[PDB]
Amino acid sequence: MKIVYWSGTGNTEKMAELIAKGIIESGKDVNTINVSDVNIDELLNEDILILGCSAMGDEVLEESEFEPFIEEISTKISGKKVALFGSYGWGDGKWMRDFEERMNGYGCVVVETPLIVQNEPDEAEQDCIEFGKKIANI
Numbered sequence: 151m152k153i154v155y156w157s158g159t160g161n162t163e164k165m166a167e168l169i170a171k172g173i174i175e176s177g178k179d180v181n182t183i184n185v186s187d188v189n190i191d192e193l194l195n196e197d198i199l200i201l202g203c204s205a206m207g208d209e210v211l212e213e214s215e216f217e218p219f220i221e222e223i224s225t226k227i228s229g230k231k232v233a234l235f236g237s238y239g240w241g242d243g244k245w246m247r248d249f250e251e252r253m254n255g256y257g258c259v260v261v262e263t264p265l266i267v268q269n270e271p272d273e274a275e276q277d278c279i280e281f282g283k284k285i286a287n288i
C-alpha cells in the first residue's frame with residue numbers, strides 16, 4: 151500500500167508514519183511518500199489511495215504541491231477507494247469536509263470517516279495506528 155502526504159511542520163507526516171505502523175502491525179507492507187516524490191502512474195495501480203494534508207490557507211488543501219496533485223489524478227480515480235487524513239490547527243475540520251465531498255464528487259468511495267488531529271498527534275497516536283488497521287482490513 152501507499153500513503154501520500156504533504157506536511158509543512160511534520161504534524162501530518164507523523165500521522166502518516168503512525169498510520170503505516172498500523173498497516174504493518176496488520177502484516178501488510180506500506181510505503182509513505184511525500185507528495186513531491188510521488189509517481190502518479192504507480193500510485194494509480196493501488197486499490198486504495200491513502201491521502202493526507204494539513205489545513206492550509208483559509209481551510210483549503212496546500213496550494214503549491216498537494217492541490218495540483220489532486221487535480222492531476224481527479225480524472226483517473228473514479229471508483230477507487232480512498233482514505234483521508236490530516237492535521238489542523240484552529241478550525242474544526244472544514245478543509246477535510248470539503249476534501250471528502252470533493253473526492254466523492256470525483257467518483258471515489260471514501261472508505262472510512264477522515265481522520266483529523268489537532269496539531270501534533272501525541273495523545274491521538276493510537277487513533278492514527280487504529281485508522282491504519284481499519285484501512286488494512288478493507
Ligand SMILES: Cc1cc2nc3c(=O)[nH]c(=O)nc-3n(C[C@H](O)[C@H](O)[C@H](O)COP(=O)(O)O)c2cc1C
Pocket residue numbers: 156157158159160161162163204205206207208209210237238239240241242243268269270
Ligand atoms: C499558512 C497556514 C494556514 C493554515 N490554515 C489553517 C486553517 O484554515 N484551519 C486550521 O485549522 N488550521 C490551519 N493551519 C494550521 C495547520 O493546519 C496546523 O498547524 C497543522 O498541525 C500543520 O500540519 P503540518 O505540520 O503537517 O503541516 C494553517 C497553518 C498555516 C501555516
